[PDB]
Amino acid sequence: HWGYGKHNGPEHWHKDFPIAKGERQSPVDIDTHTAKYDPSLKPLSVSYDQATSLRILNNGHAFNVEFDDSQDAKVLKGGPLDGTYRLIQFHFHWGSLDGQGSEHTVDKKKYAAELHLVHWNTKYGDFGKAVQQPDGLAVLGIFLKVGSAKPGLQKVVDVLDSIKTKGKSADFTNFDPRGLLPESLDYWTYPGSLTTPPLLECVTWIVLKEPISVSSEQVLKFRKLNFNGEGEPEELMVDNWRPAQPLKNRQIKASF
Ligand SMILES: CN1CCN(NC(=S)Nc2ccc(S(N)(=O)=O)cc2)CC1
Ligand SMILES: [Zn+2]
């Protein structure tokens, strides 16, 4: 029954998921002065023109926008990656206040939220097989700061009303994730894990340096969601982020 509360929060996860104290856990603080430019990095390729979203789901921890990954279309390639990774879902982590909410930090700076675009390595054939491989997943992480609105986000926030509580879902077709991307594809990369149980160490992290801006009004709508199911006492879905974990035997590489 893991969550983000006092009694079932990140400091508790290791009891059911001992890999919480592993060698390549996420997220991490990104120390910009220690990160090193890596010339071996190839150009990053974010090809989302043919993406087909299907649904949005409140899963009791976040909301996921799910994509039809039955065929190759929305893919991530290049950068640190070998091969082709298919987009399967995106979600956010966000805070109770604008000064916290991201998982990754940049010289210990917390952003108001963090977008995760989750992709799996098609050479393993299905997502389930991919999450048993050390190079199974690639997650493209994008910070959110509060300022001007992000027009490409508004459709997301406009449907949240209909998936307030855990287990609720709504149709969510024809959403274009290209509208969530910043101008620059400059990134940091390192090997890590899922940031929620079961914390599997299968992820290549690609974290963009340029945040996107969203409005106070847009993030306020995220904070009106519920962790709980329908009819249950309200627990606002806020602070669903895991803090920075030990870097251990890793180096963060910069694309720039
Ligand atoms: C048990 N089962 C394992 C598979 N899981 N599916 C997904 S897509 N999990 C997932 C969890 C966290 C991240 S994050 N936050 O690292 O991007 C990205 C993906 C669902 C639950
Ligand atoms: Zn995430």
The domain locations on the chain are: 1-256
The DSSP symbol for 105 reads E
Ligand-binding annotation for 34, yes or no, is: no
Distance in angstroms between the alpha carbons of the first and the last residue of the chain? 41
Residues lining ion ligand 2 (Cβ < 5 A) are 116
Method: X-ray
Residues in contact with 39: Cβ distance below 8 Å, sequence separation at least 6, in sequence order: none
Residue 236 contacts residue 224 (beta carbons within 8 Å): yes
Distance 201 CA to ligand 1 centre (A): 11
Ligand-binding annotation for 104, yes or no, is: no
Strands 63-67, 105-106: pairing is: unpaired
Quote the distance between the C-alpha of residue 195 and its chain's center.
8
Q: How far is the C-alpha of 92 from the C-alpha of 246, rounded, in Å? A: 22
Count of H-run helices and E-run strands, the chain = 3, 15
Could you tell me the CATH superfamily of domain 1-256? Alpha carbonic anhydrase (3.10.200.10)
Find out whether the beta carbon of 89 lies less than 6 Å from any atom of ligand 1: yes
What is the best residue among 76, 103, 196 to mutate for testing ligand 1's pocket, by most ligand atoms within 8 Å of CB?
196
**Active-site residue 104, yes or no?**
no
Ligand-binding annotation for 33, yes or no, is: no
